[PDB]
């Protein structure tokens with residue numbers, strides 16, 4: 206039994222190491238200790254001080270340099286007896302305070318124990334290095350074990366949800382939270398791994414796992430926060446039959462950050478797939494697609510970074526191609542996929558310049574021709590569609606002649622639409638393959654793009670961060686609000702506790718209905734024919750400045766507004782919001798591509814599930830309305846499941862192992878509600894059954910007995 210055998214890999218990598226006689230002496234000491242701030246300005250840097258005396262309301266303790274200070278007992282953060290250091294579930298701590306919780310995660314992390322319970326949910330602190338705890342033999346150990354029978358692990362909460370699904374006949378969800386780079390995506394993959402192994406009886410299982418490298422190659426990119434940042438969110442339904450065997454899966458994908466295809470900030474990359482193609486293509490792929498190196502392509506040569514530390518793009522391309530094979534994409538489908546990737550790189554190299562008059566011309570047609578060739582479209586039709594698109598003016602049909610900037614933006618709009626529709630097509634193709642059985646039950650794993658702050662935050666960052674704020678609201682509603690409403694509806698002598706975490710004011714600012722929040726005002730300005738980015742920001746300032754406590758009109762800029770999110774204030778730059786929200790694409794460009802000789806390109810443009818834009822009145826649904834609809838669908842789905850939460854925690858902002866930064870971590874423990882979440886578990890009454898069915902508590906409700 207590896208659990209009990211101190212020499213096992215399980216003990217070695219998932220259990221706290223045996224302490225020594227030196228540590229035993231320290232563990233039986235009668236001394237008592239306190240966590241204090243050497244520097245009072247610096248509330249998250251703590252040292253340990255010995256308590257040397259006390260009065261009825263105070264402690265005097267020594268400082269590290271030896272001096273002595275005094276603190277009111279009411280303000281004191283006591284250090285737990287050290288026997289608690291490394292404890293597996295923090296609800297067991299005698300003293301529950303910020304530096305003690307952090308210290309416990311510190312002890313575990315220092316020994317590469319990244320998983321720790323904090324009551325009913327799991328905390329996972331990213332190691333930023335590989336740790337051998339996800340092998341088949343680890344899986345085998347966890348299979349079927351109750352949570353208190355085994356060490357903290359993502360496998361354990363996965364097993365717990367899987368047994369609840371069987372035992373209760375109820376759909377489950379695993380909600381993995383965290384800011385960008387914290388570990389959501391990696392933990393999500395472990396959940397799927399685990400569920401596929403323990404509920405497996407095996408092609409379908411391979412196809413479920415091989416979905417991932419395809420989605421990541423096209424949907425992930427290096428940002429300044431994560432070398433493998435998810436730029437789309439997803440909810441993965443793992444499907445089971447009444448017997449509990451896996452019977453299929455379905456991937457709900459959420460809006461992709463398609464602006465990254467045409468622009469990346471300094472040090473960032475475009476989507477991985479562009480680098481994988483250029484590094485891994487054969488000699489004949491490269492010639493047939495007219496490819497060169499990333500440096501030759503405007504969409505890859507602007508950020509100054511074309512490589513990621515520790516990643517071989519040609520190796521990843523082999524893995525993406527093998528995943529495509531396993532999932533079932535044909536050889537011609539694959540070649541079409543790569544033609545669309547190459548063609549986008551060619552479109553980006555088109556250089557418009559100013560003609561005799563205001564209208565643009567194309568004097569060098571090399572990149573236009575190369576694109577047209579791989580796309581299987583007519584280069585004259587394409588050129589005309591870029592620079593002289595036809596529109597209605599009243600009912601008249603009028604050929605425009607766009608200037609360089611407008612031609613360039615239309616070219617960029619076409620590229621983003623090609624790439625976003627290709628992505629949707631990939632997901633649709635994958636799903637039809639995994640759609641093999643009607644499900645009896647599902648466990649849904651949610652992996653959103655995590656909370657993110659850049660030097661410049663745009664409309665995509667606001668939607669990301671709102672998603673994160675809603676997810677945090679959901680944790681709060683499940684841990685605190687619904688928990689206490691149950692106590693109240695049952696009358697068990699409970700005084701309501703204000704846990705002081707309420708995202709509602711920030712949610713209403715962003716998405717409120719009356720008064721209108723930011724998104725409703727954005728939609729308003731989006732169908733107002735005279736609107737500009739500047740009238741938009743003036744309208745936000747007029748509604749919220751010095752009226753809404755979560756909004757700030759900054760004095761240092763006329764083009765930014767601040768939103769105080771649960772995870773910190775973010776300043777958003779309003780430039781391009783109206784164009785991003787309307788997401789226009791000239792119809793003459795669609796007509797050009799509907800005519801493509803390529804079977805995949807033709808689907809992207811003729812298949813209404815892919816090509817069609819929904820309507821509202823006589824305007825295309827805006828991106829904000831599409832955002833809202835996706836989020837409201839997710840929230841509706843989660844409400845039909847029993848949720849389990851895993852809070853991923855980033856150790857620092859440099860993507861380095863062995864470097865836990867106190868301020869970085871504590872900010873997350875605070876805005877995640879981790880200590881509040883531990884307290885509700887300690888102070889409350891987690892279990893309750895309609896009557897039927899030594900010691901003390903225990904509580905009798907109007908229809909249930911509740912026990913702590």
Ligand SMILES: Nc1ncnc2c1ncn2[C@@H]1O[C@H](COP(=O)(O)OP(=O)(O)O)[C@@H](O)[C@H]1O
Nearest residue numbers: 331333334335385386387388389390391433655
């Ligand atoms: N359990 C883990 N084991 C090893 N590395 C991890 C783990 N979790 C995260 N990482 C590392 O951190 C990087 C960012 O994690 P990821 O899951 O992509 O973040 P996000 O929360 O943004 O999805 C990963 O590419 C991997 O290098």
Ligand SMILES: Cc1ccc2c(c1)C(=O)[C@]1(O)CCN(c3ccccc3)C1=N2
Nearest residue numbers: 437438459460461462653654668835836
């Ligand atoms: C439930 C839901 C709904 C919408 C979402 C997300 C999740 C995301 O995580 C993202 O997919 C991450 C990128 N993003 C996005 C991109 C461009 C414009 C708006 C949102 C997102 N929208």
Ligand code: VO4
Nearest residue numbers: 385386434435655
């Ligand atoms: O860096 V992450 O996958 O939260 O977008």
Ligand SMILES: [Mg+2]
Nearest residue numbers: 389390434435
């Ligand atoms: Mg991710």
